[PDB]
Amino acid sequence: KYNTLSNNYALSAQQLLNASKIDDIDSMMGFERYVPPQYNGRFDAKDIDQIPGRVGWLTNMHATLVSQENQGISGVDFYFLDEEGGSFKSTVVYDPYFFIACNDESRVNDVEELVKKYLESCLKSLQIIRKEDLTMDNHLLGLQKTLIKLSFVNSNQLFEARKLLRPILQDNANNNVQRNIYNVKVDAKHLIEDIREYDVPYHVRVSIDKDIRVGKWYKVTQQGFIEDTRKIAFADPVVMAFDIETTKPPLKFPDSAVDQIMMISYMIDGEGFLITNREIISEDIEDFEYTPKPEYPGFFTIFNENDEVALLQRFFEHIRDVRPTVISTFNGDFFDWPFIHNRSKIHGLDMFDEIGFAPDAEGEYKSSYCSHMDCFRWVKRDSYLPQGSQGVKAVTQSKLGYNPIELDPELMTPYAFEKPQHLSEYSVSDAVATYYLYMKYVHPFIFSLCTIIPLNPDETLRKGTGTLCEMLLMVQAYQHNILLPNKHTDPIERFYDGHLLESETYVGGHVESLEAGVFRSDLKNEFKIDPSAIDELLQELPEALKFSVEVENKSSVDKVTNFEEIKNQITQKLLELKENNIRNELPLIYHVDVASMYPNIMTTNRLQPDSIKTCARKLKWAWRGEFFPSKMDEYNMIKRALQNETFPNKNKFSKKKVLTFDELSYADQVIHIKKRLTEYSRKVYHRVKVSEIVEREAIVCQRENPFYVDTVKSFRDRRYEFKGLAKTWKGNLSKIDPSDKHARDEAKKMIVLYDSLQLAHKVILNSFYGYVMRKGSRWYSMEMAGITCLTGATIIQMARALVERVGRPLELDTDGIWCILPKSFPETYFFTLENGKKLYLSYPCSMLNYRVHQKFTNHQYQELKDPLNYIYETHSENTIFFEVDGPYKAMILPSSKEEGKGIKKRYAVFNEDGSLAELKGFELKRRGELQLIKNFQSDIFKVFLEGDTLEGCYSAVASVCNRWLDVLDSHGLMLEDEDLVSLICENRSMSKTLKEYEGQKSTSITTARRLGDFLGEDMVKDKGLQCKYIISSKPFNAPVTERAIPVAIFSADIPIKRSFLRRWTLDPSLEDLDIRTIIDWGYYRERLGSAIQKIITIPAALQGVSNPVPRVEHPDWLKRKI
DNA sequence: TAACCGCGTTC
DNA sequence: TCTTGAACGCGGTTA
Ligand SMILES: Nc1ncnc2c1ncn2[C@H]1C[C@H](O)[C@@H](COP(=O)(O)OP(=O)(O)OP(=O)(O)O)O1
Ligand SMILES: [Ca+2]
Ligand SMILES: [Ca+2]
């Protein structure tokens, strides 16, 4: 066992040891390993109650190693809650395996005989299996690839086999030995083509192959787990959510080496607790209540403990008592868990021994028996909030519907002494926000996703949405006996017309800014209808209205009883627009947007990677390349120069110290070529890279195995369910008298939840599109991605061509159009059936959908109708539909400050309600914008509603515009300094650490440097640094990069403040230290200026209005036009 | 100037 | 190791 001459003895011993500690920890938390009783009877699912075993709700799984009870045996532990409120775990053992592919299927026995002997040391078993290969000729006729399936006792032996085979695999494509040159059987090694399914994580392999999912109920029996399809609802796990608050020096981050834990707030199954560190918290806190809304009950019991070690002993003892199987936190992986771990180490406690939590290979904290649900991981991936709204406060407002307690971090340590009850109140607010966010958003979503994705809750919360897509597809391939492709790898080098490409992609979404300014439900607009368009709509009308009834409402025209009246109402309204083209009336503010655009384009056209090759449907995409201007001549020039040079060894642990170019990896060579071809091309030409768009054509086989596209259709439908439930409940709130309140607040709460669930499905669904372009994708197709995008572009431009003939489109982006139609354009109508029921009709929506189905329907969709005889039918598939929302009270579109340009992805929209309907792209939404423009925008957009005329509204908005410019002209204020610095500060997140930006300049890089010089180097040691700065006046003539002054200096001791200010301002004589005298008011004038222009001034000129805010000047390009 | 970058949006 | 995509706005810096 401990023989130091054995391969992998130290790794085997340790991996078995870790399994033994986990078995010991699970046992303490009430997860004994349960072996079901012996039963040698019928192994069927019906009469489940006859078969002995234990019923459980599956709450977790982990890979492990068991001993035979030499090496360990690979298995997965499954963690169950039982029907009598107990818990247990059960182990399934399962040989890890991968495939060998052969080029000669006639000599499979020979390669089998070789590998059996070559892999004696690590191979266990070997077997011939067959699988469908979607790259194989005539696979559609039932022909199968023949594979050698290599099995192992554990995951290490499988990795040992991979290390032994890679030598063989490389010489088979880099060696053809010569010997007798006049000889005009082939060795068995060379028949080895490839290995397949060799990198599937073990626990995924077991979850997929055995069809087990967390979230589902099983009876554990001698023959296997048997899903109890009668068990409905999840079991109720013990859930625990905690927040810690630590001491920290003024202006500095906590450091667990020195800083103490003050308190731990937590909730368990809705009951609140607070532990206090009495060495820091001035007094015993008593049992109090925080219930911010009656559905969020917050009664807390206090444990006043004597010191930090008693606080940690209390936390740990309580966890062992309640035995939680979920523990939830907010950013607990990055802060709370590592802090507790360090304070545990310092006081001589082992956190693993106490509660079985420990850091994993990614530094995240995890246990065997208990999921760690970091709500922040759900906020980043699933909540659909902008990064500016991912804090506790904004998440709580948005999802829970209330303001949680907030406290300046600089007051938190002082307040433990001066205001312990205030701090305890805050701490307990953090626990309450966390517990209820997990219970109402994270818990249902993640545990339900587990029932279809073969991952445990920890991985289902944290894995990329691409990886979630990949897992779903891997189940479908497996269950259809489809062989998995290996992970894709980018070609190290590609050429376009003898030039070396720097980057390849495709043309994506089509987006247009057409008009700027104000549009209102009451303010009138001018139109010029194209008469042609009305004749076409009249020719299309009888088929468009039929289409509406039959396709959009799945009805029949036999049962509609007001068809001709509707047709004539619309027909009369159209005929008037043809005679009276030039009109000036009330505009109707409308939005049309295709439901699930890319997934339905994919679905409609049978788009999937394996389908890209009469089964031929030819679709176009727009390839965009970026390449070096140099020809092949000049490339071979640069290469030859590099071959005369020497290069640092990437291996420190050698006396070599220098490599030749040829000795470098192909990749590292190409990196060196790219560096050189850059600088060369700047000297023989103007530009480092030239782009070029080439339209390409691809074949989409309509017959291929549709496992990929079917998965997308399935997940689309999963999302639609919650989309309709959102609508269903938005309909119920419209039929409720404002007064009820009880029925109002239940509905408003149900709409938030189903919008949240449908939006949580949106990024995963759309990642099925992006997954074909992901690094390491098993199903990579740049063609598929380009086809989806170009088709979307063609569709949205067809829509705009119609709308701009019968109305005025304002802004268009990928699948969406904001426009104004005349008040006298046929709008909303209701059909009547022979059963008294009704059918919605928006003519402006249906006029488009009719044209979409006329022009973008796939008439070549094939489906296998008889799998035994291989009989396909062909049908017509089209699931592409515009949805209409509105009409809306007002929409305001900014304009650029450069000539004949617009702003895309930025606008505001109001209901007749007065309520803000939409706000996009604007700094007030974004993270870390100057708070002035935030608060400005936050205020000015809402006042576009007040006034009677267009000049009237542009001057009512100008009143606020001048009042905001009357804070900034004061070079100061008439309100206090604590609310000045906040109005004037700029946050700006550094995604990385300060050392990794070397050779770059920015307001952030500077603020970080200066913060490190004044408060210590360990202030910039971590990534995600918030750089809270002001920009100085001095040096007067220096780049704005310099003059980034960390606003924290204005909270520093006088002699530190003065010394650093002087050192940065380059002014040794400076005495005046007031914040009002160092601010470059010229910079902030230009930036509130440049906002007021784009939202008020330049739009006014576009809508034939004199500058309604004369304080701000028009640019020269505009003024030389007026 | 023209080209380019980092952040954080809208799709 | 793990890793969805492109298009765009804004304020920056560099040969
Ligand atoms: N996060 C994303 N990842 C990849 N593609 C995306 C993403 N968001 C949007 N897209 C692409 C694919 C979508 O079909 C298209 C239109 O986006 P959008 O209209 O916001 O959503 P959608 O049309 O898919 O759903 P819906 O309109 O029903 O909310 O843009
Ligand atoms: Ca907190
Ligand atoms: Ca859409």
CA torsion, points A591, A594, A598, A600, in degrees to nearest 10?
170
Please give the C-alpha separations between residue A1046 and each of A334, A1036, A1049, in angstroms, as whole numbers: 24, 18, 6
Q: Are A556 and A547 in contact (CB under 8 A)?
A: no
Q: Are A322 and A301 in contact (CB under 8 A)?
A: no
Distance CA A190, CA A103 (A): 9
> Is the distance between the Cβ of A487 and the closest atom of strand C smaller than 7 Å?
yes
- SS3 of A596-640: CHHHHHHHHHCCCHHHECCCEEEEEEEEEEEECCCCHHHHHHHHH
Give the residue, out of A385, A505, A754, A815, with the most ligand 1 atoms within 8 A of its beta carbon, to mutate for a pocket test.
Answer: A815
Residues 557-576 of chain A: which lie with beta carbon within 7 Å of strand B?
A: none
Dihedral sign, CA of A1045, A1049, A1054, A1059? Answer: negative
Looking at the CA of A600, name the nearest ligand. 1
- Closest listed residue to residue A935, CA positions, set A861, A991, A891, A985: A985
> Is the distance between the Cβ of A816 and the closest atom of strand B smaller than 7 Å?
yes
Distance CA A349, CA A309 (A): 8
- Closest listed residue to residue A609, CA positions, set A471, A708, A751: A708
Distance CA A974, CA A992 (A): 39
Q: Are A989 and A961 in contact (CB under 8 A)?
A: no
Q: Which bases on strand B have an atom closer than 7 Å to a protein beta carbon?
A: 2-11
Looking at the CA of A407, name the nearest ligand. 2
The b-or-e profile of A587-615 (16+ CB within 10 A means b, else e) is bbbbbbbbbbbbbbbbbbbbbbbbbbeee
Q: Characterize the bridge pairing of strands A326-329 and A371-374.
A: parallel
Give SS3 for A262: strand
Distance CA A772, CA A610 (A): 10
Q: Which bases on strand C have an atom closer than 7 Å to a protein beta carbon?
A: 2-15
Q: For residue A818, list its beta bridge partners.
A: A591, A811
How many H-runs (helices) and E-runs (strands) does chain A carry? 31, 41
Residues A233, A237, A240, CA angle at the centre, nearest 5°?
140
> Is the distance between the Cβ of A388 and the closest atom of strand C smaller than 7 Å?
no
In chain A, which residues are last before a break of more than 2.5 Å from C to the next N? 69, 184, 613
H or E element, residue A56: strand A54-66
Give the residue, out of A598, A716, A905, with the most ligand 1 atoms within 8 A of its beta carbon, to mutate for a pocket test.
Answer: A598
Residues 956-1015 of chain A: which lie with beta carbon within 7 Å of strand B?
A: 988-992, 1000, 1002, 1004
Dihedral sign, CA of A287, A288, A290, A294? Answer: positive
Closest nucleotide to A511: CA versus each C1' = C7
Residues 985-1044 of chain A: which lie with beta carbon within 7 Å of strand C?
A: 1001-1003, 1039-1041
Q: Give the atom of ligand 1 at the shortest distance from the alpha carbon of A599.
A: 14
Distance CA A231, CA A219 (A): 11
| A309 CA to centre of ligand 3 in angstroms | 55
Residue A1024 (CA) to nucleotide B9 (C1'), in angstroms, measures 18
**Closest residue by Cα to the C1' atom of nucleotide B1?**
A686
Give the residue, out of A596, A852, A883, with the most ligand 1 atoms within 8 A of its beta carbon, to mutate for a pocket test.
Answer: A596
Technique used by the depositors? X-ray
- Closest listed residue to residue A1104, CA positions, set A512, A514, A517: A517
Closest nucleotide to A988: CA versus each C1' = B7
Please give the C-alpha separations between residue A137 and each of A222, A613, A802, in angstroms, as whole numbers: 43, 12, 45
Residues in chain A: 1122
Q: Are A895 and A904 in contact (CB under 8 A)?
A: no
Indicate the residue type of A883: E
Closest nucleotide to A1038: CA versus each C1' = C13
| A339 CA to centre of ligand 2 in angstroms | 13
Distance CA A342, CA A903 (A): 50
Closest nucleotide to A1043: CA versus each C1' = C12
Indicate the residue type of A128: I
Please give the C-alpha separations between residue A386 and each of A699, A701, A814, A936, A937, in angstroms, as whole numbers: 39, 39, 20, 19, 17
Residues A134, A136, A140, CA angle at the centre, nearest 5°?
65
Residue A774 (CA) to nucleotide C3 (C1'), in angstroms, measures 7
Residue with CA at minimum distance from ligand 1 atom 25: A596
> Is the distance between the Cβ of A690 and the closest atom of strand B smaller than 7 Å?
no
Residue A14 (CA) to nucleotide B6 (C1'), in angstroms, measures 44
Resolution in A: 2.5
Q: Are A671 and A654 in contact (CB under 8 A)?
A: no
- Closest listed residue to residue A169, CA positions, set A121, A98, A109: A98
Q: Are A1105 and A951 in contact (CB under 8 A)?
A: yes
Residue with CA at minimum distance from ligand 1 atom 28: A595
- Helix, strand, coil fractions of chain A, as percent rounded to 5: 40, 20, 35
> Is the distance between the Cβ of A30 and the closest atom of strand C smaller than 7 Å?
no
H or E element, residue A432: helix A420-437
CB-based contacts of A975: which residues, under 8 Å, 6+ apart?
Answer: none
Which residue matches tokens 């195995």? A705
Q: Are A62 and A456 in contact (CB under 8 A)?
A: yes
Which residue matches tokens 């559905």? A295
**Closest residue by Cα to the C1' atom of nucleotide C13?**
A1001
The b-or-e profile of A273-299 (16+ CB within 10 A means b, else e) is bbbbbbebbeeebeebebebeeebbbe
Distance CA A263, CA A303 (A): 10
What is the CB < 6 Å shell around ligand 1?
A 593-598, 762-763, 766, 769-770, 814-815
